Amino acid sequence: DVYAQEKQDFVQHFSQIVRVLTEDEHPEIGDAIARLKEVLEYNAIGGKYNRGLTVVVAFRELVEPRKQDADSLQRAWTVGWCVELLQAFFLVADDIMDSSLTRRGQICWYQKPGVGLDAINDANLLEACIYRLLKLYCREQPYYLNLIELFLQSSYQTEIGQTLDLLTAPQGNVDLVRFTEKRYKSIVKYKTAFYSFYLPIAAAMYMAGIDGEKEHANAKKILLEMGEFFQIQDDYLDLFGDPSVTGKIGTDIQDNKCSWLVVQCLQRATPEQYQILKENYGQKEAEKVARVKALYEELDLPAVFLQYEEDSYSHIMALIEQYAAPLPPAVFLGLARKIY
Amino acid sequence: DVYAQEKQDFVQHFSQIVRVLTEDEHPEIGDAIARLKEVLEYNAIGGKYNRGLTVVVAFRELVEPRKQDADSLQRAWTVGWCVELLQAFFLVADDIMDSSLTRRGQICWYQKPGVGLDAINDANLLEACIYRLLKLYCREQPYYLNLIELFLQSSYQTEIGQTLDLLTAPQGNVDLVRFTEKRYKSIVKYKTAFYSFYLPIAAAMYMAGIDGEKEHANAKKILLEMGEFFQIQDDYLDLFGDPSVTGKIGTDIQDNKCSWLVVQCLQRATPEQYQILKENYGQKEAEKVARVKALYEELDLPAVFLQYEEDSYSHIMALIEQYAAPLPPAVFLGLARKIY
Numbered sequence: 242d243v244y245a246q247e248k249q250d251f252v253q254h255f256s257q258i259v260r261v262l263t264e265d266e267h268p269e270i271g272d273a274i275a276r277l278k279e280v281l282e283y284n285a286i287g288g289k290y291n292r293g294l295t296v297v298v299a300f301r302e303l304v305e306p307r308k309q310d311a312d313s314l315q316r317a318w319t320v321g322w323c324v325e326l327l328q329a330f331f332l333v334a335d336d337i338m339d340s341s342l343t344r345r346g347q348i349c350w351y352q353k354p355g356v357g358l359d360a361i362n363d364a365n366l367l368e369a370c371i372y373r374l375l376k377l378y379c380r381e382q383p384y385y386l387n388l389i390e391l392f393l394q395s396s397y398q399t400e401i402g403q404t405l406d407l408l409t410a411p412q413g414n415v416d417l418v419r420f421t422e423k424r425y426k427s428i429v430k431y432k433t434a435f436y437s438f439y440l441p442i443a444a445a446m447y448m449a450g451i452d453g454e455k456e457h458a459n460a461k462k463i464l465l466e467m468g469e470f471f472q473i474q475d476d477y478l479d480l481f482g483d484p485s486v487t488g489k490i491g492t493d494i495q496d497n498k499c500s501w502l503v504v505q506c507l508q509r510a511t512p513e514q515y516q517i518l519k520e521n522y523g524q525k526e527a528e529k530v531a532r533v534k535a536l537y538e539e540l541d542l543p544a545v546f547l548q549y550e551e552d553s554y555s556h557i558m559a560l561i562e563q564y565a566a567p568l569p570p571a572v573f574l575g576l577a578r579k580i581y
Numbered sequence: 582d583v584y585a586q587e588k589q590d591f592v593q594h595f596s597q598i599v600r601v602l603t604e605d606e607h608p609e610i611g612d613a614i615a616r617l618k619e620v621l622e623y624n625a626i627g628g629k630y631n632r633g634l635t636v637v638v639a640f641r642e643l644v645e646p647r648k649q650d651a652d653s654l655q656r657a658w659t660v661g662w663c664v665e666l667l668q669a670f671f672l673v674a675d676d677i678m679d680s681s682l683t684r685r686g687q688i689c690w691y692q693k694p695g696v697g698l699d700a701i702n703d704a705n706l707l708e709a710c711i712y713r714l715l716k717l718y719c720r721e722q723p724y725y726l727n728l729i730e731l732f733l734q735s736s737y738q739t740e741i742g743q744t745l746d747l748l749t750a751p752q753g754n755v756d757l758v759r760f761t762e763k764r765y766k767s768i769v770k771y772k773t774a775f776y777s778f779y780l781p782i783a784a785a786m787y788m789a790g791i792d793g794e795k796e797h798a799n800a801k802k803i804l805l806e807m808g809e810f811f812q813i814q815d816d817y818l819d820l821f822g823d824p825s826v827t828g829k830i831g832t833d834i835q836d837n838k839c840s841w842l843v844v845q846c847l848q849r850a851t852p853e854q855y856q857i858l859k860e861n862y863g864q865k866e867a868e869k870v871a872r873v874k875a876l877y878e879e880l881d882l883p884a885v886f887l888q889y890e891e892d893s894y895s896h897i898m899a900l901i902e903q904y905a906a907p908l909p910p911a912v913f914l915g916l917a918r919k920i921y
């Protein structure tokens with residue numbers, strides 16, 4: 242795919258990212274800059290890079306090839322890495338707050354001996370690197386302020402979404418009463434859809450000089466729906482995915498989360514299955530978690546998900562028919578192929 | 582003082598800040614916006630406001646009174662609150678990472694039943710509010726990008742400083758060998774001096790149309806030295822200050838910190854006092870902490886600090902003589918009176 246053939250160059254650009262960001266030497270900060278290097282290497286590397294590559298792929302498809310200079314392609318790869326760094330910031334903090342164990346096939350940063358809650362500041366540093374990179378690479382470009390504002394707004398929206406995620410999942414309480422489809426859709430729009438799907442395409446758009454309100458609004462209409470599916474898939478895989486593939490161990494049941502699975506469970510459960518859920522959800526005991534997973538299987542939730550994926554795929558394609566123009570449909574099609 | 586007579590209006594502006602920031606209602610995010618309100622009220626209120634008031638005071642002294650519109654004064658009070666919000670973001674995270682107990686006369690946010698590590702996301706939200714406010718109030722102003730860049734750069738510098746703070750104070754280790762005057766001065770320049778002293782005056786400068794490199798450089802020369810003293814004072818008060826006055830309980834000894842006190846101790850200690858330090862520092866036991874405090878008193882560190890405050894005050898005033906022009910000396914004098 243077009244993600245395949247952009248990958249290698251994009252990934253190789255990381256050493257350049259790290260080089261430029263370690264050159265703040267101010268010899269006095271040398272030890273901190275070395276810590277930053279370590280943090281970047283542990284937390285920005287080892288996933289699929291789909292968000293960052295999305296910026297690069299869309300940039301190649303929206304920019305006139307004659308305008309695809311060496312320099313403007315360096316900027317695209319940099320802006321792609323900015324998206325990956327935003328992801329790394331949110332994931333470092335999220336793993337702490339979700340009490341997670343592994344991520345991307347290694348133990349979570351904060352679980353590393355000698356890191357612990359110092360990881361909070363490491364996460365803030367990852368965030369800071371975004372704006373340092375934008376200044377360094379894009380400061381003289383017409384779209385500079387547009388990109389700054391887009392990244393900050395996307396961060397605010399994600400943080401609002403994380404807020405709702407955490408409010409809906411208070412530790413060691415109950416009501417399943419909070420866990421509604423309406424609540425779920427709002428959580429995921431905010432925590433996932435904006436930064437994972439809107440951000441990378443929007444950033445490429447602005448870089449291509451496409452700054453129009455209506456063009457961004459139509460793009461957003463497709464991309465936010467993609468983002469909802471992606472988070473539903475993430476919730477499904479939390480329980481039913483293979484950790485060798487996902488790279489991480491699920492914590493949604495123990496964490497009392499408004500997962501798509503629990504929302505679907507509740508919609509289907511008999512009064513008696515409800516009581517089993519209520520007695521077993523939101524608790525660390527492996528035995529109780531296993532009971533929840535058994536309920537989910539009794540209700541054929543995996544089959545519900547497979548049906549949903551089909552209906553969602555067809556809906557997203559219908560939206561691309563409606564909303565893609567005047568942008569190349571390929572911009573959306575490539576993305577949808579990556580996620581579905 | 583001029584801080585006295587700006588205070589009331591500045592503090593009253595907070596309800597307006599909170600009002601404008603809760604009006605994102607998107608009914609769906611209502612619960613998150615209510616959490617944000619709670620976070621703002623707990624974490625942005627109850628200190629002395631000296632950083633935010635500094636923006637307002639310097640704005641009144643650098644801007645032509647004829648240009649001090651109703652609107653431009655609303656912007657100054659807003660930019661002042663932006664500085665206070667930046668402070669709140671850093672303090673929420675710092676209390677978690679320093680395992681602190683109280684702040685500003687109440688228990689730390691993260692220690693509140695039902696908050697815990699969710700406070701990490703609350704802190705990120707406080708950060709986000711800065712840029713939301715700058716957009717809302719300042720977006721059409723010539724200095725808009727200057728203020729965005731200043732706040733981001735100040736955050737990056739503070740985070741670099743926090744990095745060095747934490748690297749120098751590894752939990753449950755030793756060497757006092759790390760604790761040198763050189764290391765100390767670099768920590769505090771970065772973690773304190775930029776955001777506490779340079780930021781608020783710089784922000785007022787940019788708002789006044791003073792964007793010149795040399796003017797900012799000369800201002801920085803005074804303000805960074807003030808910031809070093811302020812952090813030395815903060816370290817002194819951590820142990821020897823009255824909690825009813827400081828609002829918080831000290832943790833520097835237990836936290837193994839490169840405090841000014843330990844650096845001064847080491848410079849003075851006999852080989853035998855060194856061994857007492859090494860045996861007792863960096864540990865939670867009240868008895869061991871008391872032994873450290875006893876060593877500090879044996880070495881007359883409080884008297885060393887009082888002498889230092891005098892020498893520092895005289896040095897800062899000498900710098901204001903050298904470097905203040907063409908800005909009103911009052912801008913620096915008022916600040917120095919507040920801290921000394």
Ligand SMILES: O=P(O)(O)C1(P(=O)(O)O)Cc2cccnc2C1
Nearest residue numbers: 331332335339432433472475479
């Ligand atoms: O931990 P992961 O499953 O990767 C998780 P969540 O914790 O939201 O499930 C972290 C995260 C953060 C923002 C948007 N989606 C996600 C997925």
Ligand SMILES: O=P(O)(O)C1(P(=O)(O)O)Cc2cccnc2C1
Nearest residue numbers: 671672675679772773812815819
């Ligand atoms: O906790 P406080 O004493 O308020 C502290 P530090 O933890 O650095 O001593 C927090 C903080 C953060 C940045 C600059 N100075 C300070 C003072």
Ligand SMILES: [Mg+2]
Nearest residue numbers: 335336339341
């Ligand atoms: Mg998680």
Ligand SMILES: [Mg+2]
Nearest residue numbers: 335336339406
């Ligand atoms: Mg999460």
Ligand SMILES: [Mg+2]
Nearest residue numbers: 475476479493
């Ligand atoms: Mg998940």
Ligand SMILES: [Mg+2]
Nearest residue numbers: 675676679681
């Ligand atoms: Mg502290």
Ligand SMILES: [Mg+2]
Nearest residue numbers: 675676679746
């Ligand atoms: Mg600290």
Ligand SMILES: [Mg+2]
Nearest residue numbers: 815816819833
């Ligand atoms: Mg302190």
